[PDB]
Design a protein around this nucleic acid. Structure first.
Lengths: 105, 150, 206
RNA sequence: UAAACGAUGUCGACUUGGAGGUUGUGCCCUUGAGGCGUGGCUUCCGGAGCUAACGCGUUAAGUCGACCGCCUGGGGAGUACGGCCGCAAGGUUAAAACUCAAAUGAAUUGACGGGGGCCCGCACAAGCGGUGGAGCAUGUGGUUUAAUUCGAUGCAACGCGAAGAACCUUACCUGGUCUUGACAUCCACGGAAGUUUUCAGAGAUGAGAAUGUGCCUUCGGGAACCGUGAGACAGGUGCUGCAUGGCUGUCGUCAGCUCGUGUUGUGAAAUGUUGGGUUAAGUCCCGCAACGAGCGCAACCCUUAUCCUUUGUUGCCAGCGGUCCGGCCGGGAACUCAAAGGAGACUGCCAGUGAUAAACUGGAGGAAGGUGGGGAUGACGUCAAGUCAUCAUGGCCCUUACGACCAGGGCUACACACGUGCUACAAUGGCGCAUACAAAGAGAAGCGACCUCGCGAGAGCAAGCGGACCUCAUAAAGUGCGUCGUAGUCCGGAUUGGAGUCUGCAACUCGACUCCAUGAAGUCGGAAUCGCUAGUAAUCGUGGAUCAGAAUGCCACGGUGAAUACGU
RNA sequence: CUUGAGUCUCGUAGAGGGGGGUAGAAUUCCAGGUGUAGCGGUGAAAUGCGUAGAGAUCUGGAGGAAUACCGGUGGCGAAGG
């Protein structure tokens, strides 16, 4: 925002804005805090076996909702759920949200 | 190769208002001479009417049908081996080669001047001779007879 | 040779000058020659000044040449002698009643000539080419110069091997026009051939 | 006997799955093909587990058990000998001497191919224009010479260095001449010098003579120079880029380089950076164990494609006074032109292809559609590349000298070959006539206005200007006018000698220019070959720098102006 | 003792062997007819075959050897096969 104001150019800075807005579109969730989250609540296993493969290699509790196609040897608190049927995943995440919004008691 | 270029857009004839005639002077340009061609080819084309004795705006093609090409050699060394492989003429060459078939024998014919030497060969095609004519006589030989390798 | 000098190709930006002035044809050439006489006999005689640059401005028949130097106390001479005597030097070696000026160089770590002077000052110190080379690199980094790739000329070691020293550190975007890279080199007449050094300080932008 | 091989001894037990194949069979409406099961044999994936590894992986190379055969570094050697067998060929059993320190296996990153597919580029293709044909100018190779100096002389030299060679230049040869010079710093000596004349010499220099003799001069005698002598001397384009710096060319405006972190692997390492499209790209997006970053491409520069802010003098003259009709003066700076700042094209949008994405396309807007158009910008690297003859530069030299001054010549000499360019070979041209036709530049030691002649060269005269104020400098091809109708030609211009103009003392060698005669080869150039992507080719001229002078070379500007590019 | 191993009842598949015949195409050869100057061969070539009748064609006849198609990552066998 400050660079496009007066620094060197108008149009090139605008190009950088319209491009790196895509960069900020990436990384949308993690963007607030210093990193190293307490735990993890991935919504599948096969699609992101790399995610669990990193969190267990680092020692973070994976709160997965395994499909039945998946490979539950890596997960931490496996949940024999169904990952498709978006209705279902919405229900799961709604319950999790209800829990976490006042887990502070 | 993979990319293509469109045909350059051309304004019509500055004198007859026909783009096809305007393109014609553009091929004969050697030494950058259209103003000389004004006294050479434009002086030639002006005489082409009365010598023909008819309107040279659409009767201008009454000597060009035989000139219509059909094939030319395309050097496809496919896989590293040069072949005959004559591809059928596409519109961006079958008309360009028609103009390429005109002044091959009209520079130093030993006459008054090529201001009107070219004004000798044109009616010859609708008088059944001239340079553009025998061009199609040799094309028929290279194709339509070598089916075992064409 | 494919490495054009980056400063002059960026001279169209705030990149400074060292002889900027005006003339007609009847007196460009002699005035240019007068500028070299002051340009050369103010460097050989001024080895210890650690001069960054001497800049020539010629307003009217009495010029205001300024000198970019490292230590303010050392360039004074014996308290104004070099101010006068070199003005005496220029009063005839340039042919005008000139006026000398002296400019300091704050943080001489920030000048590509002065650092290249510093390494060259210690190249002839009979030291090995690697340890001393990298040691100075971070010194600027602790004091800025957000990027420098450091180069030392050929003839390293007792052998025919005359190689280069690429050794990039930081950001030196040469092809980027908005780079304002600080470049000057230095060379040392060694007991065996020619040993030089090339350094590209990156002084931020604009 | 076999590469008799699944290079896996037989037998048994246990141990996640998937997809096939072939052959039985049980149940199910087999309705049927089959569904649900069950057998056997069988091919291919694959985590556990095992393996050095590849790989095996319920048909194990897994986890165990029972027996049997074999191995113990490579060669010698499956060989000698003995035996047994075989008609014989020969099989089997099976060593040793001696020799070496390895021989091996899996795989990794280079990779060379007379693997392969792909994809890029006037690479090829399709045309154009060419060179090579001639004749002229230069350069390279050779010959001669005193030298015809040196370097480069496969792609990447040969109109190169060397931006302008009569002497000079020029580093070469000869001749004459000086040898602390002719270069420069430091010594001795005295005094300024400078200049004006001589004599000889070609000058070099030598013999000079004088006018001289400025200033500090706690008055040397310096500051200076003059002229000579001893020395530290310098000095030499004198040897080494295959000692160098720097610089330059080379792939190559190449997209490829990588690095950190992360992951995989016992590890060499891989990944990223690959694949699906996409593009100028390591381009974008898609996924991808890669995520970031850096060098690269790209833009950030300049010019150019529109208009606007600010401005009109010389320049434009819209409008006003006449026109001092050219816009001259005023005068507007409307405004051509001009410049201090900007904006405008940015996939921006309609629509679509296309995974929606990216990308791409059709369309629209606006002067400007997908880096608008051009240059500046050459990554890692790359080659003993070249450069010590530009300079600097280690080492090698000699210093009355492989240092030097001066005078002739020679770098252009020829016996030829080549490199480059130009000129033609004409009537797309020539003649002269009328005609309108630009831009960029340069310059008070200059162009030189103008004025006279020279057929011209240029000369005699000369404004002006410090250059939006003066010249070069008019454009040129071009068109209409007659013209020859291809004439070895009014082509072409060599060519020669004559006549002359200027440049510079002086220009045969080795100035230019003009006039005259000169009218040659060559009438479009083979083997062939190369260049060419829009204002392109093609051209037409214009000037500039380099210039005492002496461009077909080179820089810069305009005038006119097409096709080729489907294609890997 | 019955689970290891084997016998019997019963069918299923198979280039599993051994011995017999048998068919047709195909090369070759021989005889016949027609008529003819080349045939073959390779990167070009001669040796070769041939003017007599070769090649080519159809008509037959002899012989020997293997079994196109199905056919398969199929099947069988202790291996060879």
């Amino acid at each position: 925002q400050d660079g496009t104001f007066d620094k060197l150019t108008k149009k090139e800075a605008l190009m950088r804005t319209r491009e790196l807005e895509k960069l900020e579109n990436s990384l949308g969730g993690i963007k607030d805090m210093g990193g190293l989250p307490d735990a993890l609540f991935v919504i599948d296993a096969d699609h992101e076996h790399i995610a669990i493969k990193e969190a267990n290699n680092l020692g973070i509790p994976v709160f997965a909702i395994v499909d039945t196609n998946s490979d539950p040897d890596g997960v931490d608190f496996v949940i024999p759920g169904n990952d498709d049927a978006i209705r279902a995943v919405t229900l799961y995440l709604g319950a999790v949200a209800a829990t976490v919004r006042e887990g502070r008691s | 190769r993979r990319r293509v270029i469109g045909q350059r857009k051309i304004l019509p004839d500055p004198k007859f208002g026909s783009e096809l005639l305007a393109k014609f002077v553009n091929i004969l340009m050697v030494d950058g001479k259209k103003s000389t061609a004004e006294s050479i080819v434009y002086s030639a084309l002006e005489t082409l009417a009365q010598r023909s004795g008819k309107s040279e705006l659409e009767a201008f093609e009454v000597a060009l049908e035989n000139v219509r090409p059909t094939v030319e050699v395309k050097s496809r060394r496919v896989g590293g081996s040069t072949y005959q492989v004559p591809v059928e003429v596409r519109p961006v060459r079958r008309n360009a080669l028609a103009m390429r078939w005109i002044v091959e024998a009209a520079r130093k014919r030993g006459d008054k001047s090529m201001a009107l030497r070219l004004a000798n060969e044109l009616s010859d095609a609708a008088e059944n001779k001239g340079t553009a004519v025998k061009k199609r006589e040799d094309v028929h030989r290279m194709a339509e007879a070598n089916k075992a390798f064409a | 040779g494919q490495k054009v000098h980056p400063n002059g190709i960026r001279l169209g930006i705030v990149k400074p000058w060292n002889s900027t002035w005006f003339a007609n044809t009847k007196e460009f050439a002699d005035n240019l020659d007068s500028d070299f006489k002051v340009r050369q006999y103010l460097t050989k005689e001024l080895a210890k000044a650690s001069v960054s640059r001497i800049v020539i401005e010629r307003p009217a028949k009495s010029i205001r040449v300024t000198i970019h130097t490292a230590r303010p106390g050392i360039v004074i001479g014996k308290k104004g002698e070099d101010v006068e005597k070199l003005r005496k030097v220029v009063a005839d070696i340039a042919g005008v009643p000139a006026q000398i000026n002296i400019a300091e160089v704050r943080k001489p770590e920030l000048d590509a000539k002065l650092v290249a002077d510093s390494i060259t000052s210690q190249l002839e110190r009979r030291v090995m080419f690697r340890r001393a080379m990298k040691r100075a690199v971070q010194n600027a980094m602790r004091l800025g110069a957000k990027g420098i790739k450091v180069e030392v000329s050929g003839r390293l070691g007792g052998a025919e091997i005359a190689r280069t020293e690429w050794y990039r550190e930081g950001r030196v975007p040469l092809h980027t026009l908005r780079a304002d890279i600080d470049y000057n080199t230095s060379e040392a007449h060694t007991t065996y051939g020619v040993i030089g050094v090339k350094v590209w300080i990156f002084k931020g932008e604009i």
